[PDB]
Scaffold this motif. Structure first.
Motif: not given
Ligand SMILES: [Cl-]
Length: 409
Positions: A355-359
């Motif tokens: 799971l990759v999260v970009l903020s």
């Protein structure tokens, strides 16, 4: 603009990763960059298509999906069809759920295209595709259709008829958000048995309203889950009872033979001040049901934007569209299972492995997701895993800017 939050990427590199990760085939980037041809799986006489969009119906409220025992009618209907146990909304807001099932357009840090000025006319929708293909197209709602700019977006983009509060003659119950879901569903059954007498295949989007604060709904219709009559749990349970009354009628109807139905939420009940991307809160029920649809428990990770390509394929409509969502009537390798989800300014890309999260501030978090626990731990991944996520995070924002998602064909 998504570029400002997540970092720049060359259009070429980005589009390539979007197209490749899509699994779509027969691309034709001369008209539009993700235009692709997908022949329908079903090849008999075109079926009617009924989308029963469920306001705020998160998986947390679904018994058959492990949550609170709030959906006994749906739970039963789940066994009767194609049930998706790993379905995710791309967003948290109603208009983004409408975006996903009418257009298949992925999410951005901006508002869904239902509310964007460039998408008000000639944007790609399955409504105008089906209309162009000889379908009558409609939206059935219990409240005021101008709300969230829906009527304007729908009218500007391929919907013929709009049925709203002003069209209900004698509703059993009316609340702040309009007629109860049972009245909505009686109206649906009325409209469908009407349209089925006509020559045309129809496409209907039906959107529930009862499940909104302050949670007004009829008394003595369910054994309430909470002591207080006006709660979210009870409104969900009311909406379930209301859906059951639709299907009891639907199964003895004149349109049943000829129609595909989908029960799908627009998003989970909102959570606030969550960190990164709260995956569990994009988790939603999805059910495809109809004659000749065989019961199936489908555990493949998917998004609601995969539903329109899937549904067109089921109803016998060949689809030359820019949609990058998957036709799930066809095989999908395990490594291609995925869900995109946007939580405000944060974008998440869920696969079976990572799971990759970009903020904002170009911050990148990489995790392994525990599907049973619904919890996550830190995890290192290839640059190719981050780039696929980033590429998909940017697409809608760029496609919108550049008019890559029109209804031209
Ligand atoms: Cl959203």
């Amino acid at each position: 603009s998504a570029e400002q939050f997540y970092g720049k990427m060359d259009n070429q590199k980005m589009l390539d990763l979007v197209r490749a990760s899509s699994t779509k085939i027969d691309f034709d980037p001369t008209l539009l960059p993700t235009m692709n041809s997908n022949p329908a799986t079903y090849q008999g006489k075109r079926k009617n298509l009924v989308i029963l969009l469920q306001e705020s119906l998160g998986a947390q409220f679904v018994g058959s999906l492990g949550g609170l025992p709030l959906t006994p009618n749906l739970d039963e209907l789940m066994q009767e069809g194609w049930q998706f146990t790993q379905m995710y909304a791309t967003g948290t807001r109603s208009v983004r759920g409408i975006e996903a099932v009418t257009t298949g357009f992925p999410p951005s840090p901006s508002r869904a295209v239902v509310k964007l000025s460039k998408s008000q006319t000639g944007f790609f929708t399955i409504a105008d595709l089906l209309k162009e293909q000889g379908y009558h197209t409609q939206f059935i709602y219990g409240g005021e259709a101008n709300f969230d700019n829906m009527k304007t977006f729908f009218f500007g983009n391929g919907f013929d008829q709009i049925v709203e509060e002003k069209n209900y003659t004698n509703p059993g119950f009316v609340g702040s958000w309009g007629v109860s879901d049972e009245d909505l569903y009686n109206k649906a059954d009325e409209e469908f048995e009407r349209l089925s007498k006509g020559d045309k295949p129809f496409f209907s989007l039906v959107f529930t309203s009862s499940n909104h604060s302050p949670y007004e709904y009829p008394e003595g219709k369910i054994e309430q889950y909470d002591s207080e009559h006006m709660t979210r749990n009870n409104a969900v349970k009311y909406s379930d009872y209301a859906l059951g009354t639709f299907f009891d009628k639907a199964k003895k109807s004149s349109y049943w033979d000829d129609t595909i139905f989908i029960v799908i939420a627009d998003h989970d009940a909102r959570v606030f001040g969550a960190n990164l991307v709260p995956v569990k809160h994009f988790h939603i029920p999805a059910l495809i049901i109809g004659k000749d649809i065989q019961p199936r428990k489908d555990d493949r990770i998917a998004n609601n934007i995969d539903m329109p390509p899937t549904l067109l394929s089921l109803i016998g409509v060949d689809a030359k569209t820019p949609m990058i969502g998957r036709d799930l009537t066809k095989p999908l390798a395990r490594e291609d299972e995925r869900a995109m989800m946007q939580y405000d300014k944060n974008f998440g890309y869920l696969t079976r492995d990572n799971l990759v999260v970009l903020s904002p501030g170009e911050k990148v978090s990489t995790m392994e997701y525990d599907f049973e626990s619904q919890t996550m731990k830190p995890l290192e991944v290839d640059e190719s895993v981050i780039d696929r996520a980033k590429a998909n995070a940017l697409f809608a924002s760029k496609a919108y800017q550049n008019n890559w998602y029109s209804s031209k064909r």
